[PDB]
């Protein structure tokens, strides 16, 4: 009997659980732990939050010129955030995990095509 | 010990082999067999081929007006091709397989995030 879509979904979840037990995701997890504890990241994320609250207010009241300044402040803070060591580590771990996922997707896609070819021969 | 990228790739290939043994891919395979044997599809695909050969020639010699006619002929034939029953079946099977693959990708992506959350808690 053929695998049902339901079987495949369960098997895909099993693959994901193993993917979550790779050095890549292990890196992402400890990196994430470090940015949740870093004080500088906390200070900056809060300031950004506060400014985004003002932004919504300024646009409501159509304070365009004032909005531009708040937006400049947010851009300034976001770039500062990315300069932070633990943030750089986090971004690096994110990429490692996203690249791994893409590899899995390509592998699955390419293997399916191979299996279909070996079974049919292509059209 | 954590799974290595290599382990994951192998496991992804195993998932693909099972995916290739679903009703979806089984549908794609018998649909593909039918268009490779259909005479009308063969006639049209060959005519399209021949015209694409003329197209390359016309553009080389810069026969723009003439190229436009050859391109119109190709469009006419392609649409005729899609009207063919066995082709409609093939397109339907292709979608079933592509939708299944997308589901697998989403499932893997969403389960990884869940596993990371249950292990860390998110950032």
Q: Where are the domains of chain A?
A: 1-123
Resolution in Å, one decimal, please: 2.1
Query: Do B111 and A104 touch, CB atoms closer than 8 A?
Result: no
Q: What are the angstrom distances between the C-alpha of B56 and each of B63, B68, B76?
A: 10, 12, 18
Chain-chain contact of B103 with A5 (C-beta, under 8 angstroms): yes
Name the experimental technique. X-ray
Query: Which top CATH class is B1-123?
Result: mainly alpha
Q: Which of B18, B32, B119 sits opposite A120 (nearest CB)?
A: B32
Beta bridge partners of A3: B22
Angle between helix axes A23-37 and A85-119 (nearest 10 degrees) is 150
Query: 10 Å Cβ neighbour count for A65?
Result: 7
Q: What are the angstrom distances between the C-alpha of A56 and each of A42, A67, A79?
A: 22, 9, 21
The DSSP code sequence of A20-41 is: TTBHHHHHHHHHHHHHHH-HHH
Query: Do A41 and A87 touch, CB atoms closer than 8 A?
Result: yes
Query: Do B25 and B97 touch, CB atoms closer than 8 A?
Result: yes
Chain-chain contact of A2 with B20 (C-beta, under 8 angstroms): no
Judging contacts by C-beta atoms under 8 Å, the chain B residues touching residue A112 are 16, 19-20, 25, 97, 101
Tell me how close the Cα of A75 comes to any Cα of chain B, in angstroms.
21
Chain-chain contact of A9 with B123 (C-beta, under 8 angstroms): no
Chain-chain contact of B18 with A8 (C-beta, under 8 angstroms): yes
Half-sphere exposure of A3 (CA within 13 A, CB side): 19
Which tokens sit at A25?
Answer: 């995701």
What residues have CB less than 8 Å from B121, skipping those under 6 apart? none
**Distance of alpha carbon B76 from alpha carbon B53, whole angstroms:** 16
**Torsion angles phi and psi, residue A4, rounded to 5:** -90, 160
**Distance of alpha carbon B93 from alpha carbon B27, whole angstroms:** 6
């Amino acid at each position: 009997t053929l695998y049902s879509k339901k079987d495949i979904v369960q098997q895909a979840r099993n693959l994901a659980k193993m993917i979550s037990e790779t050095e890549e995701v292990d890196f992402f997890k400890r990196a994430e732990a470090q940015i949740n504890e870093n004080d500088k990241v906390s200070t900056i994320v809060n300031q950004i939050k506060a400014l985004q609250k003002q932004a919504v207010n300024l646009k409501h009241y159509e304070k365009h010129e004032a909005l531009k300044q708040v937006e400049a402040k947010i851009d300034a803070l976001q770039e500062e955030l990315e300069e932070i060591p633990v943030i750089q580590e986090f971004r690096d771990s994110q990429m490692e995990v996203n690249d791994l996922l893409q590899l899995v997707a390509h592998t699955i896609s390419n293997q399916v095509t191979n299996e279909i070819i070996t079974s049919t021969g292509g059209d």
